[PDB]
Amino acid sequence: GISRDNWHKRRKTGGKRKPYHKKRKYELGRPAANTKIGPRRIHTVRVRGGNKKYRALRLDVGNFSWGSECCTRKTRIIDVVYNASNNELVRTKTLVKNCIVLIDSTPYRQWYESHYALPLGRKKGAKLTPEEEEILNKKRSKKIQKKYDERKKNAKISSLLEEQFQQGKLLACIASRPGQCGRADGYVLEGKELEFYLRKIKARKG
Amino acid sequence: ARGPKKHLKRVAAPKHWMLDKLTGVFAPRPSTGPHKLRECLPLIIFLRNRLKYALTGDEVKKICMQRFIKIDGKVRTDITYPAGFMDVISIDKTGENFRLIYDTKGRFAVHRITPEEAKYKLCKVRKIFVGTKGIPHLVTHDARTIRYPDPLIKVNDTIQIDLETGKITDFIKFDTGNLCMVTGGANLGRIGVITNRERHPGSFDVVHVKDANGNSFATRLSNIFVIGKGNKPWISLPRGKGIRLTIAEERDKRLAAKQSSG
Amino acid sequence: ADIQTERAYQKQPTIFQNKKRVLLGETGKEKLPRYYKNIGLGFKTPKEAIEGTYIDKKCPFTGNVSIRGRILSGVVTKMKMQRTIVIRRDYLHYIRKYNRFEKRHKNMSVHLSPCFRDVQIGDIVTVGECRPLSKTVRFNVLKVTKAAGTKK
RNA sequence: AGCCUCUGGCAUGUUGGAACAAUGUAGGUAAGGGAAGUCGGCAAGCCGGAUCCGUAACUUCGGGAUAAGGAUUGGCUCUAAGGGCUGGGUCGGUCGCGGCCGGCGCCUAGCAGCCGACUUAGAACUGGUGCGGACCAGGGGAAUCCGACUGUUUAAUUAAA
RNA sequence: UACCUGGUUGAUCCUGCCAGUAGCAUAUGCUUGUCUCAAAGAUUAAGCCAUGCAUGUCUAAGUACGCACGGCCGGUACAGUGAAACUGCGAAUGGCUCAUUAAAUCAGUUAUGGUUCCUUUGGUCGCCCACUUGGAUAACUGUGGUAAUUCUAGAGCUAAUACAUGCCGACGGGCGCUGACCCCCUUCGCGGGGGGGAUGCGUGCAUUUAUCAGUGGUGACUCUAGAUAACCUCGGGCCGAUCGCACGCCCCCCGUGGCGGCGACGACCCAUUCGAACGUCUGCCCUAUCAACUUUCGAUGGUAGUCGCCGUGCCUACCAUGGUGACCACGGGUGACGGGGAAUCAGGGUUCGAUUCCGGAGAGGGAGCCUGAGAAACGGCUACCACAUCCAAGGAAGGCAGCA
RNA sequence: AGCGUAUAUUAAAGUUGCUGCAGUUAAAAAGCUCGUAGUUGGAUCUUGGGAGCGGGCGUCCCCGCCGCCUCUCGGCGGGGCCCGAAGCAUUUACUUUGAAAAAAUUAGAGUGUUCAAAGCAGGCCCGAGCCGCCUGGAUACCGCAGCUAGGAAUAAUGGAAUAGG
RNA sequence: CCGCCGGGCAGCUUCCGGGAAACCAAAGUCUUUGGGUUCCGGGGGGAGUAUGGUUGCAAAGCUGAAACUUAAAGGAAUUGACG
RNA sequence: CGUCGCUACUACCGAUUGGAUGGUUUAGUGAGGCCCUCGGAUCGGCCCCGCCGGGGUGCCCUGGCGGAGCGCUGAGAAGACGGUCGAACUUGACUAUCUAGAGGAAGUAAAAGUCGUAACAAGGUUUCCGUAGGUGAACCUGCGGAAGGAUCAUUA
Numbered sequence A: 001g002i003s004r005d006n007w008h009k010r011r012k013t014g015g016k017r018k019p020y021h022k023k024r025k026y027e028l029g030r031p032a033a034n035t036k037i038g039p040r041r042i043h044t045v046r047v048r049g050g051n052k053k054y055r056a057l058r059l060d061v062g063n064f065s066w067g068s069e070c071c072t073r074k075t076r077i078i079d080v081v082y083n084a085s086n087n088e089l090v091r092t093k094t095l096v097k098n099c100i101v102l103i104d105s106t107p108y109r110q111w112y113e114s115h116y117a118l119p120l121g122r123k124k125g126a127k128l129t130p131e132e133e134e135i136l137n138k139k140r141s142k143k144i145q146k147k148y149d150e151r152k153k154n155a156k157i158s159s160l161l162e163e164q165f166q167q168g169k170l171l172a173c174i175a176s177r178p179g180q181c182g183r184a185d186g187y188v189l190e191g192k193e194l195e196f197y198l199r200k201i202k203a204r205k206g
Numbered sequence B: 001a002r003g004p005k006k007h008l009k010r011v012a013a014p015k016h017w018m019l020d021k022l023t024g025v026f027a028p029r030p031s032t033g034p035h036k037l038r039e040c041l042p043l044i045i046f047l048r049n050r051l052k053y054a055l056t057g058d059e060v061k062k063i064c065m066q067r068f069i070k071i072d073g074k075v076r077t078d079i080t081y082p083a084g085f086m087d088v089i090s091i092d093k094t095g096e097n098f099r100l101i102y103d104t105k106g107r108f109a110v111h112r113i114t115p116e117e118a119k120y121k122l123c124k125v126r127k128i129f130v131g132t133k134g135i136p137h138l139v140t141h142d143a144r145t146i147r148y149p150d151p152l153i154k155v156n157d158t159i160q161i162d163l164e165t166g167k168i169t170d171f172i173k174f175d176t177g178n179l180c181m182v183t184g185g186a187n188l189g190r191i192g193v194i195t196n197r198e199r200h201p202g203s204f205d206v207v208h209v210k211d212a213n214g215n216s217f218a219t220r221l222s223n224i225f226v227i228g229k230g231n232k233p234w235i236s237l238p239r240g241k242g243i244r245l246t247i248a249e250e251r252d253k254r255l256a257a258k259q260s261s262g
Numbered sequence C: 001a002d003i004q005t006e007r008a009y010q011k012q013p014t015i016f017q018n019k020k021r022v023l024l025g026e027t028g029k030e031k032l033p034r035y036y037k038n039i040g041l042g043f044k045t046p047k048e049a050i051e052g053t054y055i056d057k058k059c060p061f062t063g064n065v066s067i068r069g070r071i072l073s074g075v076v077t078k079m080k081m082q083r084t085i086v087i088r089r090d091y092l093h094y095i096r097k098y099n100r101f102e103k104r105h106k107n108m109s110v111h112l113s114p115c116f117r118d119v120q121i122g123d124i125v126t127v128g129e130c131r132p133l134s135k136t137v138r139f140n141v142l143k144v145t146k147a148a149g150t151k152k
Numbered sequence D: 001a002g003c004c005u006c007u008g009g010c011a012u013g014u015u016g017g018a019a020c021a022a023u024g025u026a027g028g029u030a031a032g033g034g035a036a037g038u039c040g041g042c043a044a045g046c047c048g049g050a051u052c053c054g055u056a057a058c059u060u061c062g063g064g065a066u067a068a069g070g071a072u073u074g075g076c077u078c079u080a081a082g083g084g085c086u087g088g089g090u091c092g093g094u095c096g097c098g099g100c101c102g103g104c105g106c107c108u109a110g111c112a113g114c115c116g117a118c119u120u121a122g123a124a125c126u127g128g129u130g131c132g133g134a135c136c137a138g139g140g141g142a143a144u145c146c147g148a149c150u151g152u153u154u155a156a157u158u159a160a161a
Numbered sequence E: 001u002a003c004c005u006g007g008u009u010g011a012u013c014c015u016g017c018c019a020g021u022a023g024c025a026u027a028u029g030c031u032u033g034u035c036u037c038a039a040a041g042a043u044u045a046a047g048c049c050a051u052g053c054a055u056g057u058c059u060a061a062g063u064a065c066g067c068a069c070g071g072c073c074g075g076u077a078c079a080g081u082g083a084a085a086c087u088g089c090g091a092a093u094g095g096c097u098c099a100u101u102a103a104a105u106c107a108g109u110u111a112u113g114g115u116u117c118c119u120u121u122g123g124u125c126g127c128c129c130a131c132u133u134g135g136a137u138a139a140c141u142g143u144g145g146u147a148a149u150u151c152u153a154g155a156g157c158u159a160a161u162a163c164a165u166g167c168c169g170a171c172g173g174g175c176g177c178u179g180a181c182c183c184c185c186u187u188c189g190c191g192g193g194g195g196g197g198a199u200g201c202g203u204g205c206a207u208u209u210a211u212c213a214g215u216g217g218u219g220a221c222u223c224u225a226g227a228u229a230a231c232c233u234c235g236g237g238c239c240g241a242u243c244g245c246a247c248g249c250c251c252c253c254c255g256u257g258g259c260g261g262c263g264a265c266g267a268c269c270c271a272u273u274c275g276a277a278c279g280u281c282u283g284c285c286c287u288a289u290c291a292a293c294u295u296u297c298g299a300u301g302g303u304a305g306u307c308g309c310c311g312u313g314c315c316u317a318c319c320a321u322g323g324u325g326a327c328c329a330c331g332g333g334u335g336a337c338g339g340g341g342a343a344u345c346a347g348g349g350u351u352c353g354a355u356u357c358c359g360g361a362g363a364g365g366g367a368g369c370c371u372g373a374g375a376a377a378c379g380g381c382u383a384c385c386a387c388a389u390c391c392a393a394g395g396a397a398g399g400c401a402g403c404a
Numbered sequence F: 001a002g003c004g005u006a007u008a009u010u011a012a013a014g015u016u017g018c019u020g021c022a023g024u025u026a027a028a029a030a031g032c033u034c035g036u037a038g039u040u041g042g043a044u045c046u047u048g049g050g051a052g053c054g055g056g057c058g059u060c061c062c063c064g065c066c067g068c069c070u071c072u073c074g075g076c077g078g079g080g081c082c083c084g085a086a087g088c089a090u091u092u093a094c095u096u097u098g099a100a101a102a103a104a105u106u107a108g109a110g111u112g113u114u115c116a117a118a119g120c121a122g123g124c125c126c127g128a129g130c131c132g133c134c135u136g137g138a139u140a141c142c143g144c145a146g147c148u149a150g151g152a153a154u155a156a157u158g159g160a161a162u163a164g165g
Numbered sequence G: 001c002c003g004c005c006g007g008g009c010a011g012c013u014u015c016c017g018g019g020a021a022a023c024c025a026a027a028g029u030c031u032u033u034g035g036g037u038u039c040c041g042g043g044g045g046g047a048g049u050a051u052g053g054u055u056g057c058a059a060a061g062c063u064g065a066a067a068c069u070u071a072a073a074g075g076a077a078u079u080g081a082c083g
Numbered sequence H: 001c002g003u004c005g006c007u008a009c010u011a012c013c014g015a016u017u018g019g020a021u022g023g024u025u026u027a028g029u030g031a032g033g034c035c036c037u038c039g040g041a042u043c044g045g046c047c048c049c050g051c052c053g054g055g056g057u058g059c060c061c062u063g064g065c066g067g068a069g070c071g072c073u074g075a076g077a078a079g080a081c082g083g084u085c086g087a088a089c090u091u092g093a094c095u096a097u098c099u100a101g102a103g104g105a106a107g108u109a110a111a112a113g114u115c116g117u118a119a120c121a122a123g124g125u126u127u128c129c130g131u132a133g134g135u136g137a138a139c140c141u142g143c144g145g146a147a148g149g150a151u152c153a154u155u156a
């Protein structure tokens, strides 16, 4: 099949290696996952060792995190943005390690709105007034008010994130191998990271 | 090759299950075990080749599957189960129980011990582990791991293991001044107190060793397994006591014992 | 400037960098806390490793590589690649017949971390055997000494 | 270039109507074979544009030479790659958004916005393998004879040596 | 044993060769009383092959209801030998040969902190079916084809450690964060301090991702270990909670509940053992009538990726424009599988090493494949090519470089 | 009891010459010169001397000593004591000692195989009442490269000079 | 004219020592074998041929094989003997 | 010594886009596997009803016999779209090796034919090198060389 060997290609100088053996079950290459975004679809593979390998071909959701806040709700991966390697993998919406992806904000919103109890985006008073104060309005007080006033200033977000939550989509980057692992795990692009990738996107579209 | 190799040619067979060129093509091959193939004694060689207890291979088959032979007090039916530095090998219907100490030439003895001294046993240590939840692990040279060791046991030291329990009972750090048998190379089954070791980064470390008579061999660390606090080996030694006599001396001393002996 | 030039973002992993809701400007003064290591065998992890703004995974003074085996030296002959040079190891291979030697050499491509500045050709350089790092390159430069010959 | 069209020009090149015979003169097309054809491949067709690949003997070392021999080529949706033009002297003072002074700045790695021709490369998708689809458009090779090459010549039968 | 003798010339001394000499290495020429050791179709043709064989396996311990035979004896399911069949292993070693292969095999040396590992050893294993739930095939029984094969049609049964499933367990008990809340001290009250909290959600050995802190271990952690947040590779993680033969017991106690030895398969974390693998440094035959090679068909490198077991131009994309060379590359050749050795030999070499020991490769040739820990496996198969058998002309079966 | 010829190959070959050939005439030194790789390259740098022990009042052979630095580093409220670290052996080349070197082969210990090629056993103790003793399965080499430790004879190589320790 | 000195062209002479010999201050320092280094020969012919490459306008130049055949060809000196 | 004469053997040149095998491969075509996307012989299970029976509180839990939605997950063959390694086949290129060949020209054998007589003696013309030109053949002649001479001198 589709081997992985130093056995065939030229030497440093530029002489052509002769063969040696046949291809052995060894220098074995399987074809790619080039995993998409759809309802979940993963085949197992039997590999060397015994052991197994979770090659994702359709993949919808990721277990993937704030840096700073120190959480990681499991969230839908909405859509691929740019992938530094190559610009088919964007268009085809192929998730691979260090793809930049849009995701659902919603599960991250909904634990400030537990924890520090201060909103995101900006709104007039439609969702906020029935439900945030349903998270707030205390009849315990004293201990708790002290507690998420100790969760002080620093229920704070960078403008760059604050923005995205209007939209209900966050920029994140894959750090697992969908084809090897079986998942599309990652971090949220946060702070410095977050600033090319916007400026890449902006400069790319023009 | 394709798989792993389940076979051993006589000749290729190491120098000490002491086999001869005629009589066969193959040698016995240690079945996989705790001890490395090259530093073994497959039980089979004791019986027919060392003790002349059996004669053939089938004679030995009929021995071990009566279930007499107990390699460290745990009964083996494998004719080719590997023994190696620091084992026991109790026969029980006989009451002999040997070790497996190597001679001064490095070729595993027929050295009988008491019924006592078949409980205590020695083992060098290969690593500290820290397994999980902070439960620390040893790895003895005979591939026992032993959980829950005294934290002062470090690497290359030896342990005075029991047997029926497993467990540990008191021990010898690897300082200067303690007693060493050598378990690899040339100075092999030769015995003496240390002196001084030479730490090198990267390449493995050298150990200078002085003996009774005053002959300094050195060795790589990974061959030295220790046997006492200093001029007091806890085990019984083989006759000769890993002193090693120059062929000149050995020749004459053997021959000088002769004539005067009667 | 300088650092993030390529396409993907280049960052020392095992430093997560952001958390800040306090005064004292914005971020620290080092700003990014820099992951570096001591390598071993006593070679001083140089100043520009620790000081440096820079980033190369294949540098042992600022990234994931282990040095672990055979330490050699050679001379720098070409610096026309980027983060790699070519060194040239000279010797006498001995014939026994002809009771004499002949000069030989096996030039050897080798990683050169850009911490390690002001290198030139005709430059004595010491190298560690590394992980098989590219196709040819298994070695990584550890201490340049510029020594024999010429000037400061 | 060819071929289709506006401006401008005609009204089919001294007649018309009706059929579609043979011979013709102009055009076309043929199963299988494929020069067997004649003095001879006489006419025609093969080739044909571009991009990519590729290239002989021989030599006057220029050539040969588009040698030879191959691949690709549509529509569509993309991507990538090729440029101009303007903008910091901000801070303080003072003078009338403007100037002047003085000070800091000094993108001197630039970045920001605003413009505008064109090209080229690559990737999907896609169509009964169609794509230089109309037209434009070198058949090739191995030899010998002659004449170094360009040119010229018998206006109305010889263009060649 | 450091070694020589014949031959050019009417005669001489040389250069120089020819010819002798001995061993070794292979031909066969003749002869052959004894006895001990002992090589053998390698060179040519990895050419071809008739036939005969070279790889099966049962303890007590995975199923056994063949009537096979007894038992010894039954009715209670067993009992005990036991032909078949499923299942688990092996078949991945060995054996053969050297076609290829010139830094390629391979030696020594080092690395794996750039990895996998059946087995053995050592360990480690408590979150309403468990008093085991379901279901389905082989032998077996019967009815079937085909000319023919180690070809099956089809109807009944019936097992399991084969295939699925999935429960007691543990403590409405304990500890992480949430907490309906509550009390006391202090305060004008806000507030400050001390407390205590029903009820939620969590309630892990492994997984992947994210973060945090700095018991033990190295020259060498970006390691082990620990803390927080998550997920489920999900049927295709594991254990989690697995099944046989010996059948031997004790109960503040009468029949239950506890207990005993053996095995088998699990397995997760792990170690270990046989390894396997891919790297380091340094090491080879001839040839210039081979001087430049290498590079959008990866050449060398950077970045980011895919694939794998893993680092890696293993592959893709985008960048750079590199790397080798007369210390002879690059090109060509070999009557080249590589070592360990051999016969020769004053010291130094010279050629041979297909040769039993080690290392490599291939089973007409390539490629791809299943299966498997482990193979790209040839005593498997899939075609093709290259070979070749039987034929009822529809079809079928072919691989000696196992031994003969 | 072997002995013949077939040819490959080694000595013989001081006829491939490193050791170690040859170049007036015998086969043979470019027509001459320049010149990049290569090979090759003067001299010159710690010594005489000291202190002792030991052979042949002193003289003349023969040995351990006067690697330096560090103590910035360990420790076998202020310590020493010096090992632990490194300046590191300028940077090698060189030499010597270790360690590592699969067995078989080889070299070669041991052994009435009846000898020998071989074999690795055998030997013994024993009238067998011992109901059993005793010993082996020696060692050297194992290129180059790699690893370790001594030495500094020679060969390169380095350091202060538009100033620096 | 008579000396000396450096380096030049040369001569004679000799049992240094070389040298098969002729001869040679050097062809000396060589089995008492190696100061440095360049080239280059390995019986004679075939053959400086064929072929290949290259330079040249070309004569040709440079690089440069084999099958085959062949026993001596040759060198230095001795007597001869014939010019 | 050479042409010339005859015979024998080698290799050479040689018109023949001469033939054969091997190795690369440019171009096309491309078996089968492998992956991906579909598919869906079928086979269930879940279920929904009709009727009936046993157990429980018209309803539920089991059982029996019928029917139907074939609702919705599972398994799931044949098959098909794509992609990847890729033997194989077809046409070019190179290089390797090996050979067929009308006729032409050397050498050698080799060794006793004819015509001379080039060389060795002052070889009758000192010899030889290189170059050139010539010639039946050795050859000859220019020019410049050489002595390996037939003169180490020519007698201020």
Ligand SMILES: [Mg+2]
Pocket (backbone or CB within 6 Å): C096, C097, C098, C099, E348, F018, F019
């Ligand atoms: Mg020599």
Ligand SMILES: [Mg+2]
Pocket (backbone or CB within 6 Å): D012
């Ligand atoms: Mg008309």
Ligand SMILES: [Mg+2]
Pocket (backbone or CB within 6 Å): D013
């Ligand atoms: Mg008109």
Ligand SMILES: [Mg+2]
Pocket (backbone or CB within 6 Å): none
């Ligand atoms: Mg026709």
Ligand SMILES: [Mg+2]
Pocket (backbone or CB within 6 Å): none
């Ligand atoms: Mg005709």
Ligand SMILES: [Mg+2]
Pocket (backbone or CB within 6 Å): D043
């Ligand atoms: Mg025409």
Ligand SMILES: [Mg+2]
Pocket (backbone or CB within 6 Å): D067
């Ligand atoms: Mg032409």
Ligand SMILES: [Mg+2]
Pocket (backbone or CB within 6 Å): D147
């Ligand atoms: Mg003309």
Ligand SMILES: [Mg+2]
Pocket (backbone or CB within 6 Å): D154
């Ligand atoms: Mg005319």
Ligand SMILES: [Mg+2]
Pocket (backbone or CB within 6 Å): E003, E004
């Ligand atoms: Mg003689």
Ligand SMILES: [Mg+2]
Pocket (backbone or CB within 6 Å): none
């Ligand atoms: Mg004679």
Ligand SMILES: [Mg+2]
Pocket (backbone or CB within 6 Å): none
């Ligand atoms: Mg001879």
Ligand SMILES: [Mg+2]
Pocket (backbone or CB within 6 Å): B001
């Ligand atoms: Mg094998």
Ligand SMILES: [Mg+2]
Pocket (backbone or CB within 6 Å): none
């Ligand atoms: Mg291992």
Ligand SMILES: [Mg+2]
Pocket (backbone or CB within 6 Å): none
């Ligand atoms: Mg050949």
Ligand SMILES: [Mg+2]
Pocket (backbone or CB within 6 Å): E364
């Ligand atoms: Mg065959």
